Amino acid sequence: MRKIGIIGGTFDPPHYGHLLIANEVYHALNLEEVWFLPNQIPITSVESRLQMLELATEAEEHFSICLEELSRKGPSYTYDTMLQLTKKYPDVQFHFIIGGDMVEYLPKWYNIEALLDLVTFVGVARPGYKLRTPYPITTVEIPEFAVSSSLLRERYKEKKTCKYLLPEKVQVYIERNGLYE
Amino acid sequence: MRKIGIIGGTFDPPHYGHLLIANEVYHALNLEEVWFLPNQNITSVESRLQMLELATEAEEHFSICLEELSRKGPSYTYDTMLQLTKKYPDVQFHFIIGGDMVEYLPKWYNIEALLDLVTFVGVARPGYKLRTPYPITTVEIPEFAVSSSLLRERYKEKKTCKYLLPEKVQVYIERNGLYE
Ligand SMILES: [K+]
Ligand SMILES: [K+]
């Protein structure tokens, strides 16, 4: 029933690439909410990541943090996570957001066909682009913003500018607490 | 000799793509300033200049250059840079272009004389090397595929533009009813 977007990631740190995708999909598909789902890490503390995530999202009631993947140590197969969430929120239609580059590879995901019954995949395409896939997925066109957590971590380490890449508030948190040096 | 960046465009509207590039090049090459150089139903010059102002008001080292606007009709880059080098003889101009454009430099009007007037700065995606016969500087910048025309289309379709251009510029747009 209720349409909720899911966006996974390390959020280490969270950045404007996350916010942009969350906002676009939120509007394109007319979602009720978008949940940011912090993954485990393949190191910044979990608390630090959640506080940055909180600062990143504090300004929009429709963005929320989901801790499911954290109540269990080690890597989670997306299927396990989504199984738990559908179990917990039976009246929610989950929209699992993925990059268009990822769409090609979906057949390689653990338990992909059972996973397809749990969620609606949303692929992010560059404007003007059609995604090629055997599976029935939704496409949302979004200008490419090639920023990533790891790129930002490098930069902070090299004392290089990050202006415009992640929220001013998260930057302050980072500098204040001396993350990524 | 002062190092000044030049970034050309319609700025119709100006957006975070512009600011991002300007900031990256400013820091990468340790420039003194970056000048935004506006090109010549169409938005008024004054509207464009005003948005450009709002977009850049917060950084003393971003400035607006009116050279191309002071000549009615379009201006080859060579003509513009010739004028600027005349007026600012002690400036080393860093003309900023997209990596995709680097391929097509040999096709520019008077490219060879132009090379003596400016240092080209090509914007590359991280990890990629630009291929060109000419001696240019490379700055790596994460791709932000936003453009004025994309934004104009978005506004006409009453579609969200959050995170794509500065709030001050959005507000300006909604208040002067631009792009509907
Ligand atoms: K919130
Ligand atoms: K300024």
Swiss-Prot record, chain A:
Keywords: ATP-binding, NAD, Nucleotide-binding, Nucleotidyltransferase, Pyridine nucleotide biosynthesis, Transferase
GO biological process, one term: NAD biosynthetic process
Coiled coil feature spans: none
GO MF terms held by the record: ATP binding; nicotinate-nucleotide adenylyltransferase activity
Enzyme class: transferase
Signal peptide: none
Record's catalysed reaction(s): nicotinate beta-D-ribonucleotide + ATP + H(+) = deamido-NAD(+) + diphosphate
Record flagged with keyword ATP-binding: yes
Origin: domain of life: Bacteria
EC number: 2.7.7.18
Pathway: Cofactor biosynthesis; NAD(+) biosynthesis; deamido-NAD(+) from nicotinate D-ribonucleotide: step 1/1
InterPro entries: Cyt_trans-like (IPR004821), NadD/NMNAT (IPR005248), Rossmann-like_a/b/a_fold (IPR014729)
General function of this protein: Catalyzes the reversible adenylation of nicotinate mononucleotide (NaMN) to nicotinic acid adenine dinucleotide (NaAD).
NCBIfam families found in the cross-reference section: cyt_tran_rel (TIGR00125), nicotinate (nicotinamide) nucleotide adenylyltransferase (TIGR00482), PRK00071.1-3 (NF000840), PRK00071.1-4 (NF000841)
Family, per entry: Belongs to the NadD family.
PANTHER family: NICOTINATE-NUCLEOTIDE ADENYLYLTRANSFERASE-RELATED, PHOSPHOPANTETHEINE ADENYLYLTRANSFERASE
Record's protein name: Probable nicotinate-nucleotide adenylyltransferase
Organism placement in taxonomy: Bacteria, Bacillati, Bacillota, Bacilli, Bacillales
Gene: nadD
